[PDB]
Subunit: 261 residues, 3 copies
């Protein structure tokens, strides 16, 4: 029976939690203003497809993070027997409440932002339509099963099963990035920039399943506030700096990526 306001106040009044959240609303807002400014000189429709898709990353981010900060996409959940976070309580409103303050809203940010990042990368890599579809479908699957795992409270073993499935989907995304697009970029004339962003993406994305396993949703070594900053830190690199680097290139090489959408 925890209200949204109660959760909104718990975030505020919790400097660790509030900061990892409000800082991204802020940074997402700046990225947007900056990116629109950087890209206002493009003309080719294909280059502009790469631009709006990249720019949509922080748009999704600022909206979703507002979802978290407002308490709209945060619920309190009790972990199943054997779960390392079973036995937690949090004090909400003015009483102790069993459960863990669960930021499931992060999965909405991901399910809606990762496909935009893959879209921009695939296009930059000159990918055909089959590889984009494969990458984006499995990536979405990865995010949805991740959310399903966080949301599962009936069985501790069930949680880790969703997690495994999500990992399998993640492998498909990684194979496309590391094996297929790495080569398609040579044919597209963007071998080096793609390779840079390919590494950045792979290194950063691998951080998420580790944080999940280590954070409150998993082994619980990282309490709620900390698992949150871990995710917020990854987001800043995987979303904002990534986009900046991608747009920095596109904004100086419009002609290399230009052509039929």
């Amino acid at each position: 029976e925890v209200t949204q306001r109660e959760l909104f106040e718990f975030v505020l009044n919790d400097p660790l939690l509030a900061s990892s959240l409000y800082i991204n609303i802020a940074l997402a807002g700046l990225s947007i203003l900056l990116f629109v400014f950087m890209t206002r000189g493009l003309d080719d429709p294909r280059a502009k497809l790469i631009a709006v898709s990249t720019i949509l990353v922080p748009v999704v981010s600022i909206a979703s993070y507002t979802g978290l900060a407002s308490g709209l996409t945060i619920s309190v959940l009790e972990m199943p027997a054997g779960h390392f976070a079973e036995g937690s309580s949090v004090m909400l409103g003015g009483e102790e409440v069993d459960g863990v303050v669960t930021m499931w809203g992060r999965y909405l940010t991901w399910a809606l932002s990762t496909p935009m990042i893959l879209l921009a990368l695939g296009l930059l890599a000159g990918s055909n339509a089959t590889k984009l579809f494969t990458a984006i479908t499995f990536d979405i699957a990865m995010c949805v099963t991740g959310l399903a795992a966080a949301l599962t409270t009936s069985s501790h073993l069930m949680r880790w099963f969703w997690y495994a499935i999500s990992c399998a989907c993640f492998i498909v995304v990684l194979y496309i990035l590391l094996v297929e697009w790495a080569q398609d970029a040579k044919a597209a004339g963007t071998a080096d920039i793609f390779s840079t962003l390919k590494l950045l993406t792979v290194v950063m994305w691998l951080g998420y399943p580790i944080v999940w396993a280590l954070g409150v949703e998993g082994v619980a070594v990282l309490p709620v506030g900390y698992t949150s900053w871990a995710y917020s830190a990854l987001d800043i690199v995987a979303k904002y700096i990534f986009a900046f680097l991608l747009l920095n290139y596109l904004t100086s090489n419009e002609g290399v990526v230009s052509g039929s959408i």
Copy 2:
């Protein structure tokens, strides 16, 4: 602990509310029939695409309004401190429940129908895929953040912040409609009808955020029943008469949009 049934009964026994909802279900059904009939002569695959995108609007609208009228997509929400509708009470079942009956289902109508309208306008204007993608993504973000604000009860300020993000998204969609597509239509040879459809669209679309701000979701100068009829009036112009006007042109100019 309000049930779907009590909401279903609350809509009934409420003049303005039931009528503004049940009227749209009826006009949507009659619209679908009239539109199918109007477009039975189409043969060009591209004109048909425009025809079906358009028809999907009243389809979305009848299914969604049935969602509201049935209570499935309605909820009772307590507004935050400072909100003009906080402190409100509503008679549901056998008590005086705290809150405001929230027609959150409306945003499901706008999120699913507006992308179809936009798909209809962009194809008609000869728009390339980049602008359709832009117009449609920011349109979806617009409707979903609008839904987020309506669903926010934690803080009054947050409600107006979501409202702000939703309006910014609205501005992008508008720019494409009035500055980009308006110009693309010339190449497409559909400049005249696009103006008409563009004009009606922008003015009607502007009505929604205005209604939001003045109704129970905003400063509540308009009561629940009244905001509902305001949204219903608008849906009638932007969903049915607008769709009719588009199909009327299309069915008399198939060759122009050929593809």
Copy 3:
């Protein structure tokens, strides 16, 4: 009612558990088999058809897990006049009014059918318009079905949603059986549609018939049988049907390539 209690309800109930854990297992094995069968495709258009088909059992293993875990199950009280009114079922160790409702099934369908449809549409040389029409109405079919299963305000609303969904059903079956059979002639794939013609009509029609008959509709079938009839179809539609599509595609890569 609790998620664990819904989860224990399915487990411990042989009929329910087997209709769910069998799909998870068969989907898991189907994904592996499908990926293996398609390891040789070289053409991009063919690859699109294959991954679009492979996603079918991917969606299935996730959604069924969604049901088996209790996440996508709920307990709803049917409205006055509904044949399942007055039902109770024992969940927290006590008597609970209502019917355990597997609404997760509509998620399974809303997410997997667009996928088999795009695979069949492409296979049929369909243009973009018929593909859009098929998928949009198909998704409208599943969403309105879910709405019907979720409506408790009145028994009448439920059937009205059902009619809306059935209307969408025919728009879809039409293009599948008629339109694409024809388009497939130019594509050189009329045969796969001709051979699977009866399989298609029967399995697709089987869903609205199970609805009307099961606890969601007139309820001549209890919950456990309502689940197995849906799960019997899913096995046909999601695994055997996808296999046949893939067996064909793999032997006819060249032609589907164009």
